[PDB]
Amino acid sequence: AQNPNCNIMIFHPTKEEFNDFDKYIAYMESQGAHRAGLAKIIPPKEWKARETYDNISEILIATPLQQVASGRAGVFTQYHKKKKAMTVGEYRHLANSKKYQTPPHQNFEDLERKYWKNRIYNSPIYGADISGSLFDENTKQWNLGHLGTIQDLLEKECGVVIEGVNTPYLYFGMWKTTFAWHTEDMDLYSINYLHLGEPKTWYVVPPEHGQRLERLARELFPGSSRGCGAFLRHKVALISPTVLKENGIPFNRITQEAGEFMVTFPYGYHAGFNHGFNCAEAINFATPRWIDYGKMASQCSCGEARVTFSMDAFVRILQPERY
Amino acid sequence: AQNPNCNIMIFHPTKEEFNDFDKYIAYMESQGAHRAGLAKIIPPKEWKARETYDNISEILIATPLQQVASGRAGVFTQYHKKKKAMTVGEYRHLANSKKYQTPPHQNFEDLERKYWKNRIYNSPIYGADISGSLFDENTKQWNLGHLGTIQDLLEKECGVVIEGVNTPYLYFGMWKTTFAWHTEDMDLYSINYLHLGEPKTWYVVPPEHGQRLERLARELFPGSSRGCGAFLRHKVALISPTVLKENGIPFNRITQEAGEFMVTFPYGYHAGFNHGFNCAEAINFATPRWIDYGKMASQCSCGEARVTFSMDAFVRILQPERY
Ligand SMILES: Cc1ccccc1S(N)(=O)=O
Ligand SMILES: Cc1ccccc1S(N)(=O)=O
Ligand SMILES: Cc1ccccc1S(N)(=O)=O
Ligand SMILES: Cc1ccccc1S(N)(=O)=O
Ligand SMILES: Cc1ccccc1S(N)(=O)=O
Ligand SMILES: Cc1ccccc1S(N)(=O)=O
Ligand SMILES: O=C(O)CNC(=O)C(=O)O
Ligand SMILES: O=C(O)CNC(=O)C(=O)O
Ligand code: NI
Ligand code: NI
Ligand SMILES: [Zn+2]
Ligand SMILES: [Zn+2]
Numbered sequence: 001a002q003n004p005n006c007n008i009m010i011f012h013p014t015k016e017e018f019n020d021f022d023k024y025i026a027y028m029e030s031q032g033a034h035r036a037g038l039a040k041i042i043p044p045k046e047w048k049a050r051e052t053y054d055n056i057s058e059i060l061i062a063t064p065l066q067q068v069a070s071g072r073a074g075v076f077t078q079y080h081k082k083k084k085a086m087t088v089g090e091y092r093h094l095a096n097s098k099k100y101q102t103p104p105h106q107n108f109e110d111l112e113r114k115y116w117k118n119r120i121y122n123s124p125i126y127g128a129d130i131s132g133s134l135f136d137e138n139t140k141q142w143n144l145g146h147l148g149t150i151q152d153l154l155e156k157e158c159g160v161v162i163e164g165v166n167t168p169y170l171y172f173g174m175w176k177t178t179f180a181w182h183t184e185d186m187d188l189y190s191i192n193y194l195h196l197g198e199p200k201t202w203y204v205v206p207p208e209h210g211q212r213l214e215r216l217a218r219e220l221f222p223g224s225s226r227g228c229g230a231f232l233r234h235k236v237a238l239i240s241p242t243v244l245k246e247n248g249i250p251f252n253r254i255t256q257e258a259g260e261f262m263v264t265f266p267y268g269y270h271a272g273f274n275h276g277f278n279c280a281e282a283i284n285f286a287t288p289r290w291i292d293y294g295k296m297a298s299q300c301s302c303g304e305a306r307v308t309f310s311m312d313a314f315v316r317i318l319q320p321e322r323y
Numbered sequence: 324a325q326n327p328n329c330n331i332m333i334f335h336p337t338k339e340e341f342n343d344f345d346k347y348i349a350y351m352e353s354q355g356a357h358r359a360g361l362a363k364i365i366p367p368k369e370w371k372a373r374e375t376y377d378n379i380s381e382i383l384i385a386t387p388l389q390q391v392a393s394g395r396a397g398v399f400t401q402y403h404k405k406k407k408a409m410t411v412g413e414y415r416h417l418a419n420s421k422k423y424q425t426p427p428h429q430n431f432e433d434l435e436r437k438y439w440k441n442r443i444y445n446s447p448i449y450g451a452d453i454s455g456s457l458f459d460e461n462t463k464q465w466n467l468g469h470l471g472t473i474q475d476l477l478e479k480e481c482g483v484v485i486e487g488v489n490t491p492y493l494y495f496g497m498w499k500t501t502f503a504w505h506t507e508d509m510d511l512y513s514i515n516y517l518h519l520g521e522p523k524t525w526y527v528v529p530p531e532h533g534q535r536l537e538r539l540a541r542e543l544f545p546g547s548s549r550g551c552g553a554f555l556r557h558k559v560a561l562i563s564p565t566v567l568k569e570n571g572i573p574f575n576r577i578t579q580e581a582g583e584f585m586v587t588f589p590y591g592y593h594a595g596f597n598h599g600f601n602c603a604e605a606i607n608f609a610t611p612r613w614i615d616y617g618k619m620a621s622q623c624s625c626g627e628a629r630v631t632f633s634m635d636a637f638v639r640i641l642q643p644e645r646y
Binding site for chain 2: 055058159
């Protein structure tokens with residue numbers, strides 16, 4: 001079996017290899033990439049997402065989210081307090097202000113130490129889940145707004161036609177902005193391109209060990225666990241790498257820089273944080289191997305987790321009992 | 324000037340001409356097609372939207388709308404009463420039931436007579452505005468889910484990058500289901516493909532005469548007009564061809580059949596009805612010529628008209644005062 005220790009793999013496709021998205025995902029999996037839950041793809045040097053990022057300041061963040069923490073430094077939840085609308089230009093200025101800017105630090109490791117030591121004592125503002133794309137329409141390869149849809153994948157694999165659409169989201173981040181431990185809706189894949197700015201650090205649990213993280217989460221967030229059988233779907237819980245090591249949870253970490261893609265694989269739990277002002281674009285996608293994971297995916301039914309309209313059809317066809 | 328009487332033109336592109344969407348729209352306008360407000364495009368015989376429509380019965384209509392009329396036979400409003408969810412298979416069966424099925428009739432003209440005589444005395448159920456597509460992903464030409472986005476058009480023309488996305492909608496219709504007099508959001512173009520089933524009859528006012536229809540509508544719906552300076556944006560008002568002729572409003576009519584595209588042009592008011600069970604797919608799009616119309620488009624501010632999240636950026640950039 002390939003990649004038995006479930007390490008995060010890094011790929012450097014040639015421009016020829018970069019012409020067929022589906023084929024390259026399948027290639028990565030033939031090398032065992034999916035066992036980690038996360039892979040990095042560095043695009044060929046000839047490729048570009050767009051010409052420049054010079055005219056993006058007028059994009060609106062209609063509902064910036066202030067991420068307020070509760071708990072202890074290595075085990076906490078965050079809730080999202082809605083703030084008034086601001087443009088990306090205004091958001092960038094805020095990110096770079098004395099109150100919110102990245103502190104002096106020696107390297108990625110020093111910054112990681114500072115994040116887990118001090119995250120809970122601040123409430124950074126995140127521009128998340130903004131429907132849109134920054135890929136040039138003329139960018140024909142790995143354009144996250146031009147991928148085959150999950151609805152068409154399900155139709156190709158299972159022969160059923162369903163309603164729903166599948167479009168990218170933009171994420172504007174600043175120092176300490178955080179994504180909580182989660183898998184994707186319906187345990188789909190995701191792909192994430194860091195367009196511009198400071199890095200994003202990722203933590204990931206191998207899909208074959210996801211239930212170990214779930215069991216620890218139930219122990220560490222007992223009230224939340226009693227409230228919902230799938231509360232990690234709420235996307236509010238954080239657990240530090242030190243606490244993961246203390247509890248024997250297998251995981252890996254890697255830092256994504258501007259110009260790089262990350263792919264998360266079905267049922268690969270991930271979490272992380274931004275180093276400073278940045279902009280990422282992400283979308284869910286599927287492959288034939290996803291179907292079995294979609295059939296088995298946990299669901300939140302307590303009402304907290306937001307459901308997209310497109311998720312309805314997934315549950316209806318793949319999980320009719322639970323529907 | 325081409326097409327000075329503002330007639331609806333019908334186009335028969337060759338398979339070679341069908342390879343460049345933007346170029347063919349520009350060609351149609353060079354022949355004066357836009358002056359009518361509406362054009363028909365019959366695709367080349369070699370083209371197909373998808374292989375078959377055999378497996379569409381499991382699509383869900385989450386919120387079927389019962390279209391209840393008030394007023395007189397030739398001048399009425401309709402409101403949409405929400406019904407419980409049903410599949411397309413269930414909807415088709417309902418459409419074909421004795422209560423809702425198309426009556427015996429001699430031709431399109433006889434059916435049109437019956438529609439305007441009797442529409443208000445029934446309340447047909449419409450499956451409208453369902454996000455999704457029935458184009459095969461392998462259909463590369465005139466695939467309504469693969470068009471250049473309006474956001475990218477605005478960026479190409481004006482140099483500003485904005486948030487927002489632009490995806491198709493499905494419409495499942497039955498006898499007497501009705502679309503009220505309207506122009507598109509931000510006076511955009513629309514394109515509509517009739518995938519399957521019975522015809523759709525369209526009425527259209529030339530864009531250069533749109534204000535004539537507005538003035539008549541203010542006279543015929545006086546309470547609505549007092550409530551909102553752009554109440555046709557509510558998409559609830561119907562006026563018959565007989566009443567249009569009585570009031571000297573220039574208009575044309577045409578019937579769309581399965582396998583045919585219709586394009587509506589900026590500020591071309593249109594209305595119409597379905598002949599029996601059918602399924603259409605539609606999406607808005609833009610061209611360089613649209614920008615001037617978008618800048619001038621009326622807006623509903625009374626709160627009735629539904630606004631998509633994507634419309635925000637259009638108003639913000641093209642109409643900053645009104646924003
Ligand atoms: C093969 C190689 C080489 C250097 C770094 C990483 C890899 S990989 N693709 O992560 O196994
Ligand atoms: C950028 C480029 C250039 C030439 C051939 C192929 C590509 S790519 N990497 O497949 O988009
Ligand atoms: C113990 C250790 C050390 C470094 C990285 C990851 C681990 S573990 N085994 O995944 O908890
Ligand atoms: C030229 C032609 C011919 C027959 C019917 C319609 C037309 S058109 N394209 O509507 O002018
Ligand atoms: C269907 C077809 C076939 C051959 C060439 C071009 C086409 S089309 N009409 O441009 O999709
Ligand atoms: C009078 C008439 C007759 C047939 C179609 C259209 C009209 S008109 N002139 O558009 O109101
Ligand atoms: O970038 C973020 O803030 C979170 N992204 C993801 O969880 C993802 O791409 O799957
Ligand atoms: O088909 C309908 O019910 C209404 N369609 C439109 O108004 C359109 O395509 O612009
Ligand atoms: Ni994710
Ligand atoms: Ni319309
Ligand atoms: Zn829940
Ligand atoms: Zn209004």
